[PDB]
Design an enzyme around this catalytic site. Sequence first.
Site, short mmCIF file in Angstrom:
data_model
loop_
_atom_site.label_atom_id
_atom_site.label_comp_id
_atom_site.label_asym_id
_atom_site.label_seq_id
_atom_site.Cartn_x
_atom_site.Cartn_y
_atom_site.Cartn_z
N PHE A 27 18.41 -59.31 -15.61
CA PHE A 27 18.88 -60.23 -14.56
C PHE A 27 20.26 -60.77 -14.91
O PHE A 27 20.45 -61.37 -15.98
CB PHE A 27 17.82 -61.34 -14.52
N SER A 95 14.42 -57.65 -20.93
CA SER A 95 14.26 -58.94 -20.25
C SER A 95 13.65 -58.72 -18.87
O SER A 95 12.50 -58.27 -18.80
CB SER A 95 15.57 -59.72 -20.25
N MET A 96 14.36 -58.98 -17.76
CA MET A 96 13.76 -58.66 -16.46
C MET A 96 13.59 -57.14 -16.32
O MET A 96 12.72 -56.68 -15.57
CB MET A 96 14.61 -59.20 -15.30
N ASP A 192 15.15 -65.86 -29.60
CA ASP A 192 15.62 -65.58 -28.25
C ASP A 192 15.86 -66.91 -27.53
O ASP A 192 14.93 -67.69 -27.33
CB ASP A 192 14.57 -64.74 -27.52
N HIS A 222 18.73 -62.77 -27.76
CA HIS A 222 18.11 -62.17 -26.58
C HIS A 222 18.56 -60.73 -26.32
O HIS A 222 17.74 -59.86 -25.99
CB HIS A 222 18.42 -63.02 -25.36
#
Length: 250
Positions: A27, A95-96, A192, A222
Amino acid sequence: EKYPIIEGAEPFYYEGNEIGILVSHGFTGSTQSMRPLGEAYANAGYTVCGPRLRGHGTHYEEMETTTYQDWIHSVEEGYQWLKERCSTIFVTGLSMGGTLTLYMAEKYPEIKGIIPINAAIEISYMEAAASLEDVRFLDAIGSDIKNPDIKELAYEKTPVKSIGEITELMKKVKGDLEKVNCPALIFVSKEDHVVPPSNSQEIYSSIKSAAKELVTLDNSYHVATLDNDQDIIIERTLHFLQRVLETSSL
């Protein structure tokens, strides 16, 4: 050409053998965070697809207008490109992109295995930010990277409207985690600052896969695909793919 693709944010496609890897960025991010993984998997002989999510790699004002169904569709389109060339398909994402990896495994029992990296399923701050009525943009979330000499290509602002979309996607994917049955290699950073590491721990304990492993990355934040532990992600992913592909009755 209102919102041209930024140099380095193009989708990537590598033609290889009949085994395909779908690789999703996250994202506000772009394929720049994932291309080192895609190149390494292509060098190992695999067919590789790294889609550009709709509204990403262009301008955050385009992102603002996109839906989570748009982002799903971008991944589905890459899955279809792989299905045209490959008989076995794995999915990985950051992540996303990891949320979307889980979405695909929840929907498609044929997927051979998944490798989510710092996947997002529940971020209480984003739930609250999604409800802001009079704020259009919050600060960038990108470039949470421990190595100070490494930069991520990601937007400089985060659209509040888009936060509502990711929140809805996460709620859907979280609720369906028991539908995941394929082998899973789950990577999570120790430190993260964007997605709580407890998200990946909850994924591990909620999926139904008989074969599951969680690997903690001690030297990355992250954006682990660009960070100090990139080599661990690449090499352990390659070992995982080999082990799944070599599985027989014996």
